[PDB]
Design a protein around this ligand. Structure first.
Ligand SMILES: [Ca+2]
Length: 279
């Protein structure tokens, strides 16, 4: 399949080189996989999600996304126009309030929720979770991300937007999950992207067009935008039979474009997510 004039991030993920605008992907498109988006929630009714999005959990007075951030993330995972996995099921878990804040305790409960809740969903092809959130190092937060992963969910998490070493951030510093840095359209590290030996991969994170609340769209930036590219790519690869929750991060890093990014600090991986689709 070929989606012409795709958002640059989508084109990039299916390309060996920067500067192109068509997204190529196998038509299976993530069918029969599931992606949890753990964030401010998801405007499920957005036409772009086509009935494939559902809120399954909130810790606040409402499950609606009153912010937009989670909806944007969800659209990059799986909206028909802006998404990597155009046929995946999307499940929203609202651990962040409408100001995009959440206490660590709520975030942890949200991770544990998905680790059980995937047993209530139909995802023959596998399960992914996209966690575009972050705060200072906490072993409890790391440990919750590690449980989520060991239960059989491919966990992808934002490296953070501090332009600093991600070792100091959670769940970014958790070794067993996929920690995702942000790049821009000219293949430079995003200027806000964290870095470090704890990073596993980079995805498109600067000027990322996707869904927003009120049924609209917008371009925004962050390692939080890069994460759902990798989350969507895992779902897509898993439905193709290429990999599993337990090895998806590894496989993505093995099949990445390598040594193509600029401003990567000494000791951080120079790997850009890539679907290796032979159209
Ligand atoms: Ca990690």
């Amino acid at each position: 399949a070929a989606q012409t004039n795709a958002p640059w991030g989508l084109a990039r993920i299916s390309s060996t080189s920067p500067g192109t605008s068509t997204y190529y992907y196998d038509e299976s498109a993530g069918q029969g996989s599931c992606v949890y988006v753990i964030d401010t929630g998801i405007e499920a009714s957005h036409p772009e999600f086509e009935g494939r999005a559902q809120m399954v959990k909130t810790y606040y007075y409402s499950s609606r996304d009153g912010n937009g951030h989670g909806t944007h993330c969800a659209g990059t995972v799986g909206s028909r126009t802006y998404g990597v996995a155009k046929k995946t099921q999307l499940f929203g878990v609202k651990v962040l309030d409408d100001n995009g804040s959440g206490q660590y305790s709520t975030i942890i409960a949200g991770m544990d929720f998905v680790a059980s809740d995937k047993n209530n969903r139909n995802c023959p092809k596998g399960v992914v979770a996209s966690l575009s959130l972050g705060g200072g190092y906490s072993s409890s937060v790391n440990s919750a991300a590690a449980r989520l992963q060991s239960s059989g969910v491919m966990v992808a998490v934002a490296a953070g937007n501090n332009n600093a070493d991600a070792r100091n951030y959670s769940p970014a510093s958790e070794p067993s999950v996929c920690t995702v840095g942000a790049s821009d359209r000219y293949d430079r590290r995003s200027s806000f992207s964290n870095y470090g030996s704890v990073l596993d991969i980079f995805g498109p994170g600067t000027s990322i067009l996707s869904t927003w609340i009120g049924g609209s769209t917008r371009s925004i930036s962050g390692t939080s935008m890069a994460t759902p590219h990798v989350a969507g790519l895992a779902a897509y690869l898993m439905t193709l039979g290429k990999t599993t929750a337990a090895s998806a991060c590894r496989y993505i890093a093995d099949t990445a474009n390598k040594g193509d990014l600029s401003n990567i600090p000494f000791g951080t991986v120079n790997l850009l997510a890539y679907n290796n689709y032979q159209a």
